C-alpha cells in the first residue's frame, strides 16, 4: 500500500507520503482537497530520513536533498519535474528557461500548468520557478507559501565565514 506522517514546518503541515522509504508525496495538505489521503496509512515515524532533512532546510542547515522519490505523472511532467530538479538551492528560473531546457521552446505555460501538479513540494523546488512579470502564483495560500520558502533561501549566509579571515 502506501503510508504518510505529517509534521510542523513555518509554511504549515507537510504531509509526507509513499511506499516504504520512496517519497510520492510532499504537500502542504490542510484547507484542500486530497481524496487518496483516505486510502493512506498512518505511519508515525515513516520517512525519517526526509523528515530530518526538512527540518535542516527550514533551519538553513540543509541545501540538497538525499532522498529517494517516485515521481508519477505523463511524460511532459516527467520532463519538467526532472529539469526542477537542477535548479540549486537560492536560484530562479523562468518557464521560459526551463521551456527550453526540456526541449520545448515556447511552451512556458504547459510548463506553468505541469509545474502546479507537482507531487513533491520543496524537493522537487516548484517554487524556483517565476515568470517574467515576477508575480508569484497559486491557490489555497501557495503563493505566501512559495514566498515563504523563496525568502528563506535567499537569506543564506556565507558558509565558510573564514573566507573572510
Not at 10 to 24: D, E, F, K, N, R
Not at 141 to 148: S, T
Amino acid at each position: 500500500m502506501v503510508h504518510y506522517r505529517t509534521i510542523d514546518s513555518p509554511i504549515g503541515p507537510l504531509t509526507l507520503a509513499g511506499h516504504g522509504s520512496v517519497l510520492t508525496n510532499l504537500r502542504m495538505l490542510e484547507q484542500t482537497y486530497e481524496p487518496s489521503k483516505t486510502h493512506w496509512t498512518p505511519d508515525p515515524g515513516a520517512f525519517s530520513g526526509a523528515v530530518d532533512q526538512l527540518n535542516a532546510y527550514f533551519a538553513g542547515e540543509l541545501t540538497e536533498f538525499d532522498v529517494e522519490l517516485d515521481l508519477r505523472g505523463t511524460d511532459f511532467q516527467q520532463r519538467v519535474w526532472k529539469a526542477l530538479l537542477t535548479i540549486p538551492y537560492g536560484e530562479t528560473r523562468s518557464y521560459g528557461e526551463i521551456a527550453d531546457q526540456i526541449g520545448a521552446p515556447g511552451a512556458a505555460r504547459a510548463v506553468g500548468l505541469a509545474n502546479g501538479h507537482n507531487p513533491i513540494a520543496i524537493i522537487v523546488p516548484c517554487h524556483r520557478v517565476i515568470g517574467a512579470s515576477g508575480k508569484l502564483t497559486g491557490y489555497g495560500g501557495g503563493i505566501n507559501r512559495k514566498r515563504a520558502l523563496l525568502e528563506l533561501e535567499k537569506s543564506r549566509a556565507p558558509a565558510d565565514l573564514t573566507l573572510f579571515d
